[PDB]
Amino acid sequence: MYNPYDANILRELAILYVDYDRIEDSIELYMKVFNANVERREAILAALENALDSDEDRQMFPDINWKKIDAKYKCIPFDWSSLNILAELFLKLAVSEVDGIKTIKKCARWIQRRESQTFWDHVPDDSEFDNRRFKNSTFDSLLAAEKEKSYNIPIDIRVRLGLLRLNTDNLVEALNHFQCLYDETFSDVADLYFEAATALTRAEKYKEAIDFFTPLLSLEEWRTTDVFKPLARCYK
Amino acid sequence: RPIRLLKDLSSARDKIERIYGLNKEKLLLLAKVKEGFETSVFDFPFKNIQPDSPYFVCLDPPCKKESAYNKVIGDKNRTVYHEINKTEFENMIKLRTKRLKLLIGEVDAEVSTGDKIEFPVLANGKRRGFIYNVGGLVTDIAWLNIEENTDIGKDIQYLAVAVSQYMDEPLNEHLEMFDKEKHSSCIQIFKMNTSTLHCVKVQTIVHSFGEVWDLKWHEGCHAPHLVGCLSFVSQEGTINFLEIIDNATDVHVFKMCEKPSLTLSLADSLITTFDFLSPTTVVCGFKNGFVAEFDLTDPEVPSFYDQVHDSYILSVSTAYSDFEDTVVSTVAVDGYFYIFNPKDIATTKTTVSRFRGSNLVPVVYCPQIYSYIYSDGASSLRAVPSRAAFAVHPLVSRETTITAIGVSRLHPMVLAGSADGSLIITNAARRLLHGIKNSSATQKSLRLWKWDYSIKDDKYRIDSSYEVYPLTVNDVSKAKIDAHGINITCTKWNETSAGGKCYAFSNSAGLLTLEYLS
C-alpha cells in the first residue's frame, strides 16, 4: 500500500501466499499486475491517437500528454523476467494446467506487442512458436508489419510450457517445445535438461528421459547420482 | 401417345409437363430454379439464395407452417432436467481417451475430445471452416434454423450431434436395431457464427434412451425461453421431443433428462423412423413393417396403424407441395420403395423399385425439384419425382455404398457420402429439369473431400484434392470394403440464407467437419 510500484515486495508477498497454501492467490496477485500492463498499452496508443488527431516510447512520441497519462497509468513493468517465474508458479500449482497454458499464451503474446492476433488463443496448437505459423489460414490475412514482428519467445518459457504440456499428457507439443533445447548452447540449459528428463521420468516416458539425460554425461557438474540413479532405473 | 417408360418422354417440354403437370404457379418455381442454378455445376452464387434475389425460391417444411409449441408442448409439458458435474458425465459416457492422429494437407495433429482445427492452407484453394473431434460414434447431426427477421444476430446458428459412447467397432451388442435397448448416449449442442466460424459447445444433454437418429429441429416450436425443440427416434423404440431451454450465459453446461416433453410409443412395437406431415402430426414406421400417423396433441392413440412392409421400415420421408397431396415414401429391409397418400394407403400405394435387402438406405426429399433422392441400397444415387414413379433418373455412381445424403430447402445441391470416406456434390436440378438424350455427358459430380486410413500408421488422412466423376449410366453396383472409422454417418447443409453455403459431415470415428463454400 505504501509502494505499489516495487517488484521485490510483490515477489516475496507472492512467495508467502505459496507457503500459505494459496498458490491460486499468488497467481491472483500476478493477474492484477498483468492486467495493469495490458491497460497501459491501450492507454499509451490511445494517447498517441489523441496526439495525432490534435520509456523509449516517450522518445518515439514526445507530442503526447505524458505528465497526466503516465501519472494516471504508473505500474510495475511486466516482461519475460516476470513470465518465467509465473510459468513456474503454474507448475507449482499442478491444477488448471490448460488455463495455465492459456494464461502463459496471453502473457507471451502481449510481450511481443502481437496481442491483437486473437486467433492464437482460440486454436489448440502451438503454431505461433514455430514455422507451423505459416500453415494456419488466418496468418496469411495479417498486415505486413504483423508478419514482421517477433514470434520468438525465450528458451526458458518454451521449456516451462513443454513441462506444462507434458503434465497435460500432450506429449507431441511437449517435444515440439523441447526441440529448441537441442538447437541452443547446452552450457546455458543443462539444468533445464535435468528438469525435462526428470519430468519425463515422472510422466513414465523413461526412454525419452534417458535421451534427455544423455547430454549431462559430458560435464563433471552433471556426471552425478542425480543422473546415474534415473539412468539405471529407466534401464531397469 | 402410350407414355409408359422413361424413353417415351423424348421431347423436353413433354418430359416437364408429364413429370410436373400444368399448374401455372408450380411451373414458375421450375423456371426460377433452372435460370438461378443451370450454371451452378458444383457451387452456386450466394446472391441466389438471399431473400431478395430475382431467382429466390424457398419451400418451408410442413412442421414450420404454423406455431406448434402451445399444441406439442406448452407450460403443461416442460422438459424435466437437472444439471451435472464433469466427473459423473465421464463416468457413464466414456468418450474416447486416446488422441487421434489427423493429417490435413501438410499438418499433423494429435486431436483430443473437443479440439477444433481450422483448415490449414491447401494447394487447391482458400478452404474455410474446421475439423473437430466429438469423441465417439456420430449417429446423426441436425442444423437448427432461425427466421432472419428476428432480433437474434443473423449470423448466429445452432447445430446438434448425437454421439454414442461406442466406438470404431461396427458390430456391437449395444447398436442393435431389432430389439429395444435403453442406454446412456448424448447430444452436444453447438453455437456458431456463420460470419467468423467461431464455435462453442453450449450444452451437453445426457439421456438413457439409447442411440439417436432421424434427429430434426421442430421449426414451429417457438417460445422466448427456447433455442428450439429437438425431435428424434431412439433405440428405446419411442419418439422423444425435448426442449432446448436457453442459458443466461455462453458458459458450457452438462444436463441429464428425466422426462422429455412428448413421448410417442405403441404397445409391443418399436418406432424406427419418422417425419412431420403438419406442425402437430407425424408419420412413423415400426419394426413389424407397420406405418402410423401420431397426433402430437393427442399422443395416446395413433390416427391409423396399417401394415405396409414385410419387415423393418428403415426410412420414411414426406414430399410436401403447395399444389399436390402430402405423399409419403417408405423403404424397408424387404427392399420395396413405396409412395402413398396418408388419406388412404390401400387406394393409393405405388411402387418405385425393389432393391437388394440393404441395412442402411438413405432417402431424402429435394423440395426445389419435387423429387425424392435415394441410395439404391447398393452404390448408386437416384432421383424419383413424386408424381411420376417410373421416371427414375440415376445421378451418380460410387465404388462403395452411399450411406448418408443431405439436401436443402433453398438450393438443389445434393451431398452424398460413401462408406469409402468420399464426399460428393452434384446438382440434381440439372438432371430433373432437362432433356434425356445427352445425360451421359451433360451431368457430372465433384468430390469435395476424402477420408483415408493406414492400418500401420493409424492416421486419418483427409485429402482436399478435388476429383470429377462423370455419369456412368449403365454401371454395375460395387462394394469395396474400407476402414471402419472412415465411413460417412451423416451430411447436411445449413438451410438459412446466411448459412446456406455451409455444410457439415461426419465419419464414424468422430471427425465432424464443417466448411463454408466461399
From Swiss-Prot, chain A:
**Which domain of life, per UniProt?**
Eukaryota
Question: What does the record list as GO biological process?
Answer: 5S class rRNA transcription by RNA polymerase III; transcription by RNA polymerase III; transcription initiation at RNA polymerase III promoter
Question: What's an example of a GO molecular-function annotation for this chain?
Answer: DNA binding
Q: Where in the cell is it found?
A: Nucleus
Result, substituting V227K: RNA polymerase III defective
Q: What is its main location?
A: nucleus
| Chain positions with Phosphoserine modification | S54
**Residue ranges of coiled coil:** none
- TPR repeat segments run 7-40, 155-188, 190-224
Keywords assigned? DNA-binding, Nucleus, Phosphoprotein, Repeat, TPR repeat, Transcription, Transcription regulation
Post-translational modification here is noted as:
Phosphorylated.
**A single cellular component GO annotation:** cytoplasm
Could you give the subunit structure recorded for this chain? Component of the TFIIIC complex composed of TFC1, TFC3, TFC4, TFC6, TFC7 and TFC8. The subunits are organized in two globular domains, tauA and tauB, connected by a proteolysis-sensitive and flexible linker. Interacts with TFC1, TFC3, TFC6, TFIIIB subunits BRF1 and BDP1, and with RNA polymerase III subunit RPC10.
Question: What other comment is given for this protein?
Answer: Present with 876 molecules/cell in log phase SD medium.
Name the job this protein performs: TFIIIC mediates tRNA and 5S RNA gene activation by binding to intragenic promoter elements. Upstream of the transcription start site, TFIIIC assembles the initiation complex TFIIIB-TFIIIC-tDNA, which is sufficient for RNA polymerase III recruitment and function. Part of the tauA domain of TFIIIC that binds boxA DNA promoter sites of tRNA and similar genes. TFC4 is the TFIIIB-assembling subunit of TFIIIC and essential for viability.
Q: What name does the UniProt record give this protein?
A: Transcription factor tau 131 kDa subunit
Q: Which organism is it from?
A: Saccharomyces cerevisiae (strain ATCC 204508 / S288c)
From Swiss-Prot, chain B:
Keyword Iron-sulfur attached = no
Coarse class of the primary localization is nucleus
Keyword Plastid among UniProt keywords: no
* Its biological purpose: TFIIIC mediates tRNA and 5S RNA gene activation by binding to intragenic promoter elements. Upstream of the transcription start site, TFIIIC assembles the initiation complex TFIIIB-TFIIIC-tDNA, which is sufficient for RNA polymerase III recruitment and function. Part of the tauB domain of TFIIIC that binds boxB DNA promoter sites of tRNA and similar genes. Cooperates with TFC3 in DNA binding.
Q: What is this protein called?
A: Transcription factor tau 91 kDa subunit
Q: Which residues form a coiled coil?
A: none
GO MF term list: DNA binding; RNA polymerase III general transcription initiation factor activity
Organism of provenance: Saccharomyces cerevisiae (strain ATCC 204508 / S288c) (Baker's yeast)
**GO terms for cellular component:** nucleus; transcription factor TFIIIC complex
Keywords of this entry: Disulfide bond, DNA-binding, Nucleus, Transcription, Transcription regulation
Query: Between which residues do disulfide bridges form?
Result: C221-C229
Per UniProt, subunit arrangement is: Heterodimer with TFC8. Component of the TFIIIC complex composed of TFC1, TFC3, TFC4, TFC6, TFC7 and TFC8. The subunits are organized in two globular domains, tauA and tauB, connected by a proteolysis-sensitive and flexible linker. Interacts with TFC1, TFC3, TFC4 and directly with TFC8.
List where in the cell it is found. Nucleus
Which residue stretches belong to region Sufficient for interaction with TFC8? 5-518
Q: What else is known?
A: Present with 1130 molecules/cell in log phase SD medium.
The Gene Ontology biological process annotation of the record reads:
5S class rRNA transcription by RNA polymerase III; transcription by RNA polymerase III; transcription initiation at RNA polymerase III promoter
Report which part of the complete sequence is shown. 155 to 672 of 672
